[PDB]
Curated annotation (Swiss-Prot), chain B:
GO terms for biological process: translation. Transmembrane segments: none annotated. One of its GO terms (cellular component) is ribonucleoprotein complex. This is Small ribosomal subunit protein eS27. It comes from Pyrococcus abyssi (strain GE5 / Orsay). Part of the 30S ribosomal subunit. A zinc finger (C4-type) spans 19-41. One of its GO terms (molecular function) is zinc ion binding. The gene is rps27e. Belongs to the eukaryotic ribosomal protein eS27 family.
Curated annotation (Swiss-Prot), chain D:
GO terms for molecular function: rRNA binding; structural constituent of ribosome. NCBIfam families: PRK04034.1 (NF003115). The lineage of its organism: Archaea, Methanobacteriati, Methanobacteriota, Thermococci, Thermococcales. This is Small ribosomal subunit protein uS8. It holds the Pfam family Ribosomal_S8. The gene is rps8. Belongs to the universal ribosomal protein uS8 family. It comes from Pyrococcus abyssi (strain GE5 / Orsay).
Curated annotation (Swiss-Prot), chain E:
This is Small ribosomal subunit protein uS2. Pfam families: Ribosomal_S2. Disulfide bonds: none annotated. Keywords: Ribonucleoprotein, Ribosomal protein. InterPro entries: Ribosomal_uS2 (IPR001865), Ribosomal_uS2_arc (IPR023454), Ribosomal_uS2_CS (IPR018130), Ribosomal_uS2_euk/arc (IPR005707), Ribosomal_uS2_flav_dom_sf (IPR023591). The gene is rps2. It comes from Pyrococcus abyssi (strain GE5 / Orsay). Signal peptide: none annotated. One of its GO terms (biological process) is translation.
Swiss-Prot record, chain G:
It comes from the Archaea. One of its GO terms (cellular component) is cytosolic small ribosomal subunit. PANTHER family: 40S RIBOSOMAL PROTEIN S2 (PTHR13718:SF4), RIBOSOMAL S SUBUNIT (PTHR13718). InterPro entries: Ribosomal_Su5_D2-typ_SF, Ribosomal_uS5, Ribosomal_uS5_arc, Ribosomal_uS5_C, Ribosomal_uS5_euk/arc, Ribosomal_uS5_N, Ribosomal_uS5_N_CS, Ribsml_uS5_D2-typ_fold_subgr. NCBIfam families: PRK04044.1 (NF003125), uS5_euk_arch (TIGR01020). The gene is rps5. Part of the 30S ribosomal subunit. Contacts protein S4. This is Small ribosomal subunit protein uS5.
Length: 36, 63, 61, 129, 196, 89, 229, 152
RNA sequence: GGUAAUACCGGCGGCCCGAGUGGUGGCCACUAUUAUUGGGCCUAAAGCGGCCGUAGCCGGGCCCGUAAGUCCCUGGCGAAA
RNA sequence: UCGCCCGGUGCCGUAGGGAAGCCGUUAAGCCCGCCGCCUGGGGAGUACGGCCGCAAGGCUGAAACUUAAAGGAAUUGGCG
């Protein structure tokens, strides 16, 4: 997914393993719900 | 003086071994890669082992 | 200011490189002779380089 | 692999003399290397040198005097016109005649100070000061 | 030649070294025992003791240092200090003796004698900072870094540290006119060594 | 491209509020009673151009560089700023 | 040039010397500034310099480069400290730079000025530029460079009349040493004045590590220390 | 370093600098040419002819004598063989490499999951092609020749 | 800047340029923040997960030729402003 | 068991380099080569397009706008 290790640093954010999983769900909804 | 790193020189010699059951005189190598046998009779003179051979005759010189 | 060779600068007796104002050099009279003064720069003292007196032949540390 | 036997020599010389050595061995010995030693000698930077043959391209023994600050190779080997020397002398050397700049002119190898007397140019190969 | 007979250098153990080498000491080593323990030269210990004696007899006698932090080389430091006019500091060399003028023990020498450059490295550093020659007793394991005159000698045993300082203290007398001949030094060697 | 523009014959200071320079120029203006500052920088430039000319004829060598060298002395002493014995340096 | 020659006589009498160099200077064996340097001595009394270079304390051979105040934390507040950076030198060949600390601005300046004298060095001057080829001690005789911290400094010779075109603090240091013309090239962060100052100091010291033949001297004008006061 | 691995390694043979044959030799040039030709007809590789001359007959390398028919060149084993017509029909470097990549190619036909051996095959073929490019360039190999593995 | 403002708004002093002096937009230097001269890539931005190879750039020592690159001298040119 | 030469694998360490932590002939040193990537923090590895995969997914990859810091190596304390 071409990610950058600056974001696994957790200081003022949430975890990135869990932002990935949430971007993937939207990239799905834009695909099925008439992504054609 | 004159380090080995410039003009390298070997560590192995040419011998002038002399046979046992043949009397013949020859020249051989000290670190052979084969089985040096006599040039008339056929008995071995040196044997190949790793680094330096283990000769089996009488030496006359180191040449 | 009366420049008749007002001074000269000392040089190391092994390499010939003159000595900077504040380094850990040394000088002393030649052992075994007593007639020559011997200089050693900091870098020839640190890696122990041999010297030899310019008058007799006595050598090294 | 090996690409330049002259650069290796000049870096070896300036690395050795910086720690106090009094002899070096320039192993792969061209005659360009010998020709540049010849002009490093006439200006008083090295002592005496000899060519020793070893069956494979020969070696060079040279004695140092602790009289050089820096030596190196001008690599891309630019060309120079006979009236454009100062532009390069202001780039490599530290004052208006401090040291030599070695030039591969069409009449041999020489320092730029003797090229300006004949008025010729050529390729720059190295510099010593 | 041979300030003492060879059977007396060897009897002390001046020549016994250690199981560690160094490229600096490579000219003072002599061979290797099959045990793996190096042996020093003795002709060189002699020919260096003479030079060290006639070099030290050129300073004003109240401006010498003998130092030792080991325990076996402390009584030979005081006797050497008393026979010549030199000064001696046995025990711990507390720092700032040559650098701090705010201390009661301030003293600036002209040379300094070091028994072991490894155990006595504080005084070695303080001597580098001041620019005075250094005369040291080197063993097979030490480096010659900053040493200006070396003396190859087993500098650890108890009977060898007394034979070195004895010879050095005698030869200093013979070179400044305090003595006529070498056999006019009537002080037995046992007075130098530390008692068991 | 574009045609010729007429240019200014003086130069302003790089920073306008350096104290050790306002202090140095406040003296030359009361001693000679010049009207404004732009009247003072013009003379500084008249001098800096001479100086920058002598720096180029000093490294240079050739046939006409010689001719340009001794036209600088000739005028520079026709103007009373040098004596009759002065060399380029 | 006398007002600083009765100062020497006054100090040379009520000063009881405690090291060897002080003894030598008091007994008239050492009598010039130029012969305490290239020998490996140690300089621990500031009065070796008030007697051999008296005009070093002339209030126009002194300079205060910066004043800072710094802090350390504790369960009862903030413990504050000063830091002065000072340099001294006669404008002929000799310069020194020191720092010194305290709790007040006055004590800190005193220590700065004091330590500046003990960290003194002598340099070389000349003229090595391509444009001006005079032979006069007004600039640096050749290109030299020095470094400190994260600052890299290079100094290049320049022609006679051009100012000292270097940063804001380099002028003080270079002008106390006797230079008057230079060019410059810098890298690193030049806004930490301690490291920038110590880089310029290191360059002026490195002036005397370059090997030179006796023919270069009567081509660049190289003088060491005073050059005809 | 090595071509494919990167270990250094330094083992090799270190020769003395010398121009003329040694004094204790007694084999003249023709007595050595006959020796060189006698052994090839026992089926000996041009590398293993020199080993035997050096070990048993006591001849240090044959590159000490000049070429009898030519003062420029020096004598080499391959230049003796081509004098009699016995020299190989393909450079034997290439032949050894090609022959070693033919019984590895029938091992890899019964063990097709031996994935660590089939990398050595790719590396051998890389070497074969590196050599064919050079030989074609120097005219030792006719230009209508290609390494086709399905033959031999 | 929170009822004790050298920082806002007026008075009176002072400073910089001066027939000018300020405001908004654009390009260059500042910037070694585009790096041929002349930057970076362990922890700050940044070494492909690893290896094989086609084009291209870089290539060991000596001897004899050629004169394309390169260097010096000389004729015809590169309008005026 | 001891000594030496060559190649691998570890540690303490001179000169030197670095902002330091620390690297130091198994370089992060001084040189000669070739290729890949970097240009304040977010928006964003997103939208739109293309090529692969049976799908899950891989590879390529901007701008409107918004912000004055975001990052690194080490100090004195307070705290668990
Ligand atoms: Mg950068
Ligand atoms: Mg990173
Ligand atoms: Mg070539
Ligand atoms: Mg025109
Ligand atoms: Zn037999
Ligand atoms: Zn020296
Ligand atoms: Zn002597
Ligand atoms: Zn000048």
């Amino acid at each position: 997914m071409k990610r950058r290790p600056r974001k696994w640093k957790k200081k003022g954010r949430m975890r990135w393993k869990w932002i990935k999983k949430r971007i993937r769900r939207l990239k799905r909804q834009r695909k099925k719900e008439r992504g054609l | 003086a004159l380090p080995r790193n410039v003009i390298p020189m070997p560590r192995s010699r040419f011998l002038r071994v002399k046979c046992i059951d043949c009397g013949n005189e020859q020249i051989v190598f000290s670190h052979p890669a084969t089985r040096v046998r006599c040039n008339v009779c056929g008995a071995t003179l040196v044997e190949p082992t790793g680094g330096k051979g283990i000769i089996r005759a009488k030496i006359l010189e180191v040449l | 200011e009366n420049v008749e060779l007002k001074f000269e600068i000392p040089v190391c007796t092994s390499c010939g490189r003159e000595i900077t104002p504040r380094e850990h050099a040394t000088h002393f009279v030649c052992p075994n002779c007593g007639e020559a003064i011997i200089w050693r720069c900091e870098t020839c003292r640190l890696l122990a380089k041999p010297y030899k007196c310019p008058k007799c032949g006595w050598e090294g540390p | 692999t090996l690409l330049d036997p002259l650069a290796n020599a000049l870096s070896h010389i300036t690395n050795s003399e910086r720690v106090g050595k009094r002899e070096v061995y320039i192993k792969p010995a061209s005659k360009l290397i010998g020709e540049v030693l010849r002009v490093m000698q006439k200006y008083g930077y090295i002592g005496e040198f000899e060519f020793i043959d070893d069956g494979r391209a020969g070696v060079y023994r040279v004695q140092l005097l602790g009289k050089i600050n820096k030596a190196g190779a001008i690599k891309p080997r630019f060309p120079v016109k006979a009236r454009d020397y100062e532009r390069w002398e202001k780039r490599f050397l530290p004052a208006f005649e401090f040291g030599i700049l070695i030039v591969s002119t069409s009449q041999g190898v020489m320092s730029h100070k003797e090229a300006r007397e004949k008025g010729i140019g050529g390729r720059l190969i190295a510099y010593v000061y | 030649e041979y300030l003492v007979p060879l059977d007396q250098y060897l009897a002390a153990g001046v020549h016994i070294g250690t199981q560690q080498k160094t490229k600096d000491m490579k000219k003072f080593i002599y061979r290797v025992r099959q045990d793996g323990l190096y042996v020093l030269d003795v002709r060189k210990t002699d020919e260096r003791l003479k030079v060290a004696g006639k070099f030290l007899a050129r300073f004003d006698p109240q401006s010498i240092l003998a130092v030792s932090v080991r325990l076996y080389g402390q009584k030979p430091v005081k006797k050497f200090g008393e026979v010549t006019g030199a000064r001696a500091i046995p025990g711990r060399f507390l720092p700032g003796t040559m650098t701090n003028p705010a201390v009661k023990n301030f003293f600036e020498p002209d040379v300094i004698i070091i028994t072991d450059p490894r155990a006595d490295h504080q005084a070695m550093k303080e001597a580098i900072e001041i620019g005075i020659p250094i005369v040291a007793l080197v063993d097979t394991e030490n480096l010659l870094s900053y040493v200006d005159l070396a003396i190859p000698t087993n500098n650890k045993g108890r009977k060898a540290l007394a034979l070195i300082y004895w010879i050095l203290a005698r030869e200093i007398l013979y070179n400044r006119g305090e003595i006529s001949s070498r056999e006019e030094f009537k002080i037995p060697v046992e007075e130098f060594e530390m008692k068991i | 491209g574009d045609p010729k523009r007429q240019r200014k014959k003086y130069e302003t200071p790089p920073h306008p509020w350096i104290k050790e320079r306002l202090d140095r120029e406040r003296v030359l203006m009361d001693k000679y009673e010049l009207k404004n500052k732009k009247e003072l920088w013009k003379h500084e430039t008249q001098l800096k151009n001479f100086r920058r000319r002598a720096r180029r004829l000093l490294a240079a060598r050739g046939k006409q560089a010689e001719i340009e060298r001794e036209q600088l002395l000739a005028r520079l002493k026709r103007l009373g700023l040098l004596p009759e014995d002065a060399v380029l340096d | 040039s006398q007002e600083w020659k009765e100062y020497a006589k006054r100090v040379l009498d009520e000063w009881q010397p405690k090291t060897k160099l002080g003894m030598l200077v008091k007994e008239g064996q050492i009598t010039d500034i130029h012969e305490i340097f290239r020998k490996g001595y140690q300089i621990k009394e500031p009065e070796i310099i008030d007697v051999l270079l008296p005009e070093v304390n002339a209030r126009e051979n002194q300079e205060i480069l910066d004043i800072a105040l710094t802090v350390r934390m504790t369960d009862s507040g903030r413990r504050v400290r000063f830091r002065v950076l000072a340099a001294v030198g006669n404008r002929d060949g000799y310069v020194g730079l020191g720092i010194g600390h305290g709790r007040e601005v006055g004590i800190a300046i005193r220590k700065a000025i004091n330590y500046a004298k003990l960290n003194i060095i002598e340099i070389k001057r000349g003229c090595g530029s391509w444009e001006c080829r005079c032979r006069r001690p007004h600039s640096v005789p050749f290109t030299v460079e020095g470094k400190e911290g994260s600052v890299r400094v290079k100094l290049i010779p320049g022609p006679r009349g051009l100012g000292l075109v270097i940063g804001d603090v380099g002028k003080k240091i270079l002008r106390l040493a006797g230079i008057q013309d230079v060019w410059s090239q810098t890298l690193g962060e030049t806004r930490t004045t301690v490291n920038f100052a110590k880089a310029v100091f290191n360059a002026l010291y490195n002036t005397n590590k370059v090997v030179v033949t006796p023919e270069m001297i009567e081509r660049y004008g190289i003088v060491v220390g005073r050059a005809m006061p | 370093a090595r071509m494919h691995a990167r270990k250094r390694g330094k083992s090799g043979s270190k020769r003395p600098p010398r121009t003329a044959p040694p004094i204790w030799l007694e084999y003249t040039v023709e007595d050595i040419e006959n020796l060189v030709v006698k052994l090839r007809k026992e089926g000996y590789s041009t590398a293993m002819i020199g080993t035997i001359l050096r070990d048993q007959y006591g001849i240090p390398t044959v590159k000490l004598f000049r070429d009898p028919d030519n003062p420029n060149r020096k004598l080499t084993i391959t230049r003796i063989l081509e004098k009699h017509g016995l020299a190989p029909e393909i450079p034997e470097d290439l032949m050894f490499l090609i022959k070693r990549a033919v019984n590895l190619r029938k091992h890899l036909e019964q063990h097709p999951k031996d994935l660590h051996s089939m990398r050595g095959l790719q590396l051998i073929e890389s070497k074969i092609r590196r050599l064919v490019k050079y030989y074609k360039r120097k005219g030792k190999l006719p230009k209508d020749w290609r390494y086709d593995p399905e033959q031999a």
